[PDB]
């Protein structure tokens, strides 16, 4: 079956779109801890915009909240609540 | 029967322009009164004001000093007896 | 009021995910073309395997044709057919 | 009653290994003829062949020379009363 030019494109337009994000990147300090999981699912821009000149970008944020564990090396291990930051609405501008 | 001159509602048809410049969605209609709708996708909905965006049945809609909101992908919209129809466009700048 | 460890841990494990990959890095060949959309949804190995030595790689695979636009400047602009390549099995495995 | 000496529903419970080395799914069960299932996350069930995988209602689930197939989620399910009971351990290779 092959994908109609129009579904691959609506599709593929720059938008939010579940993103599975590395905690270390976003928390790039705590690199004493091990995390559990490593990374986390997030909805982010994404996406093209069609035009070297356009970027997709995130025009609304939030934050969600979420149960990490981190262990420490050798002394013990908690269960974390970590933020993470969330793109609701994105938009093709120029970079 | 058909609202629009020339349709393109599988393959987009291309439209070179250029930011700054003026750019032509050509989506002309059969008769002067027949009304048309301009959406930008993901989901806008271009409306004309008389100024920067004008409609002319004759030519289609005439954007002059075409934005980066006005790269991408344009459908004109026309009713015409209960029927909806949409002919697409896709800009390319440069 | 936040996302339970087992909930981000599931939902973060290595598998196939719907990832919005650039045609060029797929066919660093053709840049003489203008490809529209520039990018396309293929399902691809994400997530996280949680442990350094593991790497969430692909272990069934399969190709995927869509309909994309090629604007060769100054110059025609058809719909090509193209093939893409996507993941089916996600594992986690010793890099 | 509850199979379960130990109930870890919520949050797995750590479990520090080392891969070629054994490995010991605590999950214990009050009873020799409970009969309990080892899942790994997301499609697996470990299977006890007698041999690297073998099962001891006293103890638990005892992998001998322990791959990567099993870093990970794993979950000790048993259903007593027509009821479905699992304690979930989570392999760390240090």
Same mark, same amino acid.
């Given at each position: 079956?092959?994908?109609?030019?129009?579904?691959?494109?609506?599709?593929?337009?720059?938008?939010?779109?579940?993103?599975?994000?590395?905690?270390?990147?976003?928390?790039?300090?705590?690199?004493?801890?091990?995390?559990?999981?490593?990374?986390?699912?997030?909805?982010?821009?994404?996406?093209?915009?069609?035009?070297?000149?356009?970027?997709?970008?995130?025009?609304?944020?939030?934050?969600?909240?979420?149960?990490?564990?981190?262990?420490?090396?050798?002394?013990?291990?908690?269960?974390?609540?970590?933020?993470?930051?969330?793109?609701?609405?994105?938009?093709?501008?120029?970079? | 029967?058909?609202?629009?001159?020339?349709?393109?509602?599988?393959?987009?048809? /291309?439209?070179?322009?250029?930011?700054?410049?003026?750019?032509?969605?050509?989506?002309?209609?059969?008769?002067?009164?027949?009304?048309?709708?301009?959406?930008?996708?993901?989901?806008?909905?271009? /409306?004309?004001?008389?100024?920067?965006?004008?409609?002319?049945?004759?030519?289609?809609?005439?954007?002059?000093?075409?934005?980066?909101?006005?790269?991408?992908?344009?459908?004109?919209?026309?009713?015409?007896?209960?029927?909806?129809?949409?002919?697409?466009?896709?800009?390319?700048?440069?």
């Amino acid at each position: 079956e092959v994908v109609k030019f129009m579904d691959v494109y609506q599709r593929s337009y720059c938008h939010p779109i579940e993103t599975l994000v590395d905690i270390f990147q976003e928390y790039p300090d705590e690199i004493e801890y091990i995390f559990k999981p490593s990374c986390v699912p997030l909805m982010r821009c994404g996406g093209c915009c069609n035009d070297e000149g356009l970027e997709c970008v995130p025009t609304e944020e939030s934050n969600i909240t979420m149960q990490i564990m981190r262990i420490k090396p050798h002394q013990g291990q908690h269960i974390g609540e970590m933020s993470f930051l969330q793109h609701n609405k994105c938009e093709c501008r120029p970079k | 029967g058909r609202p629009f001159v020339e349709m393109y509602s599988e393959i987009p048809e /291309i439209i070179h322009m250029t930011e700054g410049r003026e750019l032509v969605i050509p989506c002309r209609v059969t008769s002067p009164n027949i009304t048309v709708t301009l959406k930008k996708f993901p989901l806008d909905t271009l /409306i004309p004001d008389g100024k920067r965006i004008i409609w002319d049945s004759r030519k289609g809609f005439i954007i002059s000093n075409a934005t980066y909101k006005e790269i991408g992908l344009l459908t004109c919209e026309a009713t015409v007896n209960g029927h909806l129809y949409k002919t697409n466009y896709l800009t390319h700048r440069q």
